[PDB]
Structure formats: C-alpha cells, structure tokens
C-alpha cells in the first residue's frame, strides 16, 4: 500500500498549475507568445522537480 499511494500521488501532482495559465504545456505553448511562455513554463518545471 505505502508504495502504491506514493506513486499515484506523483501521477496526480501533474494536473496542478502551481500558479500557471494551465497544466497542459501544449495550451500554454499556443495561448501565449514565445517570450512569455517561458516564465509560465518554469512555474511548472520547478514544482515538478
């Protein structure tokens, strides 16, 4: 159990914005301009590390 909970709570912190337009990198990489879709990526990249 302890081991299954630990994973399922890692493949679920993927659908979390951490203060970002959306949690789909595709979206943010369209509804936004190249020099702004960087700041809103490092919000995701940082909370996933």
């Amino acid at each position: 159990n302890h081991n299954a909970q630990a994973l399922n709570t890692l493949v679920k912190q993927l659908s979390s914005k951490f203060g970002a337009i959306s949690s789909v990198l595709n979206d943010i990489l369209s509804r936004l301009d190249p020099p702004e879709a960087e700041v809103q990526i490092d919000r995701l990249i940082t909370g996933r590390l």
Binding site: N1, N3, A4, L7, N8, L10, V11
Partner: protein, 39 residues
C-alpha cells in the same frame, strides 16, 4: 513441498500467496490494472 502443484509450494505457502494481494507491473505488455503510472 506438494509435488502435485505446478509451483511446488507447501500447502501453507499456497494460502500465504492467495491471501497477500498485489500491486506490481513487471508484465511484458501490461478502467485500469493498478499499474496506471507507467503512462
């Protein structure tokens, strides 16, 4: 060991393997069978 079974496990190790449920995924090809992180 019971020489009948194809596992050759004692009458009591067979009750210990049917009472402990599982959650692995070393399957060679795999609504979802526990293993839902693979993806």
């Amino acid at each position: 060991p019971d020489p009948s079974k194809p596992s050759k496990r004692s009458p009591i190790e067979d009750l210990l393997f049917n009472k402990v449920t599982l959650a692995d995924a070393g399957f060679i090809k795999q609504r979802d069978l526990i293993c839902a992180q693979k993806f």
